[PDB]
Amino acid sequence: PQITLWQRPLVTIKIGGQLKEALLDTGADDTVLEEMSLPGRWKPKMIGGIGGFIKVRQYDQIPIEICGHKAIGTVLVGPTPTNVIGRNLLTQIGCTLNF
Amino acid sequence: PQITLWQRPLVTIKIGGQLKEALLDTGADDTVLEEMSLPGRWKPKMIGGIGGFIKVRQYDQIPIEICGHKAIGTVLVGPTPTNVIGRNLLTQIGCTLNF
Numbered sequence: 564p565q566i567t568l569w570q571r572p573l574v575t576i577k578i579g580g581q582l583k584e585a586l587l588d589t590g591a592d593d594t595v596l597e598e599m600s601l602p603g604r605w606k607p608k609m610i611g612g613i614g615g616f617i618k619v620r621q622y623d624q625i626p627i628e629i630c631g632h633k634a635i636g637t638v639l640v641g642p643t644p645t646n647v648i649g650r651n652l653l654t655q656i657g658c659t660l661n662f
Numbered sequence: 663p664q665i666t667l668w669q670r671p672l673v674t675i676k677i678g679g680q681l682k683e684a685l686l687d688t689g690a691d692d693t694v695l696e697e698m699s700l701p702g703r704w705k706p707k708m709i710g711g712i713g714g715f716i717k718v719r720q721y722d723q724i725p726i727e728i729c730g731h732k733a734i735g736t737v738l739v740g741p742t743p744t745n746v747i748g749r750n751l752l753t754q755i756g757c758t759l760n761f
């Protein structure tokens with residue numbers, strides 16, 4: 564698809580059996596989602612943004628589906644005010660900026 | 663241009679006759695730059711990030727070049743970790759996401 568930027572670029576993602584709304588976010592290195600359960604190993608991480616840092620749990624090798632596009636990658640879970648899909652997963656669905 | 667997302671989408675901007683580096687950030691509503699001088703009067707704004715809110719100065723109708731593309735619009739100035747070009751200016755330069 565071609566996604567306009569007049570509005571926030573929200574999409575539905577399928578992850579861990581759940582459907583969530585998330586922001587396609589080229590300024591995020593990493594995908595960060597609100598509190599949820601995921602399976603397997605994780606390690607603590609601090610990530611930083613406008614306003615400072617938050618602590619998250621880093622899960623690796625998590626399957627996700629975005630707009631029909633399957634991918635696998637790292638998902639950070641913690642107290643983000645909004646769900647963001649970061650570059651680590653945007654690359655995998657072949658997402659580019661164009662102008 | 664078409665910009666892939668394997669690295670941060672950093673571009674050169676020009677504002678007030680000076681070159682800076684900034685991040686093309688589809689997850690930002692608003693453009694926010696690190697401390698700098700701009701002309702005219704400013705209004706107050708709070709903007710909300712991953713780690714909470716910060717106070718910024720809002721300047722309106724500021725000329726800014728982004729990757730050589732000419733825009734004129736609102737620039738927020740404050741203690742952001744990184745210069746970000748948000749959707750308010752990405753729309754002026756005809757930017758879309760595509761996959």
Ligand SMILES: CC(C)CN(C[C@@H](O)[C@H](Cc1ccccc1)NC(=O)O[C@H]1CO[C@H]2OC[C@H](Cl)[C@H]21)S(=O)(=O)c1ccc(N)cc1
Nearest residue numbers: 590591592593611612613687689690691692710711712743
């Ligand atoms: C997270 C969005 C809801 C909004 N944010 C833009 C977002 O792309 C934000 C931009 C940014 C970049 C580097 C450092 C600080 C902030 N990205 C972001 O927080 O990414 C997080 C998760 O991935 C990491 O890679 C970048 C930072 Cl260090 C971490 S923002 O808080 O920075 C923001 C909010 C409003 C405006 N007008 C501008 C920016």
Ligand SMILES: [Cl-]
Nearest residue numbers: 635636637651
């Ligand atoms: Cl990854």
Ligand SMILES: [Cl-]
Nearest residue numbers: 654657666667
């Ligand atoms: Cl590619």
Ligand SMILES: [Cl-]
Nearest residue numbers: 735736750751
């Ligand atoms: Cl504007």
